[PDB]
Amino acid sequence: SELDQLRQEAEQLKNQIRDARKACADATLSQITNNIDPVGRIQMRTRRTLRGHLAKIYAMHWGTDSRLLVSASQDGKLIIWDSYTTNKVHAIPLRSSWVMTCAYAPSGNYVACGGLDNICSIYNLKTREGNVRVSRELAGHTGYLSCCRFLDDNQIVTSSGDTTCALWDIETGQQTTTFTGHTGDVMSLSLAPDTRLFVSGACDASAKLWDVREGMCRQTFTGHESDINAICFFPNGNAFATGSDDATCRLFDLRADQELMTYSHDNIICGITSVSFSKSGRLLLAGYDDFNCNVWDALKADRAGVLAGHDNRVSCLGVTDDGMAVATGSWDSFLKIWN
Amino acid sequence: DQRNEEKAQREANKKIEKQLQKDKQVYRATHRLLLLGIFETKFQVDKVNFHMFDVGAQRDERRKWIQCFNDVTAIIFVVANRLQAALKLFDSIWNNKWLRDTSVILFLNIEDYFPEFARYTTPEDATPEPGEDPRVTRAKYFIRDEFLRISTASGDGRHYCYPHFTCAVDTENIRRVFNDCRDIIQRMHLRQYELL
């Protein structure tokens, strides 16, 4: 049949890509950084403990100021905290109690959030009146929203339960581009520092790189073991890291088109709910289901330290723009800040 | 100086605290439920607020959004080849690392698919209603025993199952969920003081 030939052309082309990847393969990052000394045993003290939530926290996001952070809880609240003084600057009630993602535009003006409801609610902060009402409700997605990020005060990119990732327009309120072709529910995404390309991780053990201007995926990294839950860009616009439900972090490179390092011990059997880098890209922080998060050496594949202060599973983790502290939110309705 | 703006921030914090306290009172004063097998359905039962949520428009894959329902009082699970899928669905939800502390309520809405229905005997402790033949009653009890074998296989997380029958009108089913929810809440309190 002609369909079998189509499948034949696919498997033979995949083999060619795999051969090309193995052809450009050389001494990996493992043995060329042997002379580099280890980062050394570092400690991470819990400076603050942002309490006040009721249900489990699911997402968080810093701001350009690197002192105000927004968090979302399943109890139907969206609280914007002041990390320096630990004061709730705002507390927005959500029309839907189930929220799984919250974003903070890079202007301290708008705040997006989504969850089981396919609608993505964007709230305005600098409102003329005291109340902070709903500025816009983006609708059209056919699946639960898993992660949304702000490109600017006019555009917003969101991920949904459906494979389609859509780039919206807050002014017109209609989808401008619909990235598709993942075959799985996109769990999260990561915006490059240059805001030209962005990667996305789904539950098919693959990561796709999409250009915001066009709708075609540039590359496809499939070297994981199970569904990818978290993904973050390296702070240089040339690499990124991913995490799946196998306690295995993978550091992929854009130009190499293959994995560089795998971070996994032999005494931990858990998932990876969050992934983030430091300001210099040397410390790779990743949360697990073992009630604590770890920090690995991005160039030595060695465990730099362990941050264990939570009483439940860590669900969100984020580093500031300037990398002064680390905010981690777990399912115990407690959001801590490590520095 | 910074003193004025600090009290304005402090007064704002005190305002959120005053609001969050009342929000916590109404939140803890109500219970949330899940119906599977998002549309909201709220109703009161003897001055007890219930918030039943039904997942809608979501894809078939449920290994991710089902985790958001960890802190739920009870997960109502209805059933209908046609049943073996539901059997495995309950089996997969029962011994899950995240839903191990969440109980499940069963609302049960043939010989070809299951061969055990041949040499199976009706339990002597049954309560057969004399309005129907023993054929259907033996069928419901067989499905009940099958679901129980899947339930009591592993109770590590210590979560219970409540099998019920759809023998009455909906207004009577609400009373059932109310009694089951009360039982689950009481058992939790009993284990919170280390009595059971």
Epitope: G184, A205, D245 | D60, E61, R62, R63, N95
Partner: nanobody, 128 residues
Framework: QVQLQESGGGLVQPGGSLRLSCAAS????????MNWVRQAPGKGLEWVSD????????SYTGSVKGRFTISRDNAKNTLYLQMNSLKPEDTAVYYC?????????????????????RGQGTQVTVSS
């Protein structure tokens, strides 16, 4: 790249036997519980059998209780399903499914319409 390539199938008269080996590659084998799911012509996906990591609690569906038998090999990364006393109604596309979570006794979406961890197995005809 996780992929599951299987063999066997074809046409066999009713009451015969058949052996399908699902060669799993691209992932560690002795960490997930492999399952078998079929899709009859004109019907949806259904669960047939399963097996643990090493194999201690093997389960089958009522329709195949006692007829089929499932076995795996962690050394060769293979998954076999021997058939005995076929039935004319057993014709279907038998897929090879891998549960998403390792070290877990449960797994969802095994019978979902779309599943990235499926082997796209061949059609197996039982008729005359």
């Amino acid at each position: 790249q996780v992929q599951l390539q299987e063999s066997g199938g074809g046409l066999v008269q009713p009451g015969g036997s058949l052996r399908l080996s699902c060669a799993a590659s691209g992932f560690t084998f002795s960490n997930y519980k492999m399952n078998w799911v079929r899709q009859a012509p004109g019907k949806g996906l259904e669960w047939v059998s399963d097996i643990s990591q090493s194999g201690a609690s093997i389960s089958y569906t009522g329709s195949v209780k006692g007829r089929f038998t499932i076995s795996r090999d962690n050394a060769k990364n293979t998954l076999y399903l021997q058939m005995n006393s076929l039935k004319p109604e057993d014709t279907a596309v038998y897929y090879c499914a891998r549960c998403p979570a390792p070290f877990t006794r449960d797994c969802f979406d095994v019978t979902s319409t779309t599943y990235a961890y499926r082997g796209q197995g061949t059609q197996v005809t039982v008729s005359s």
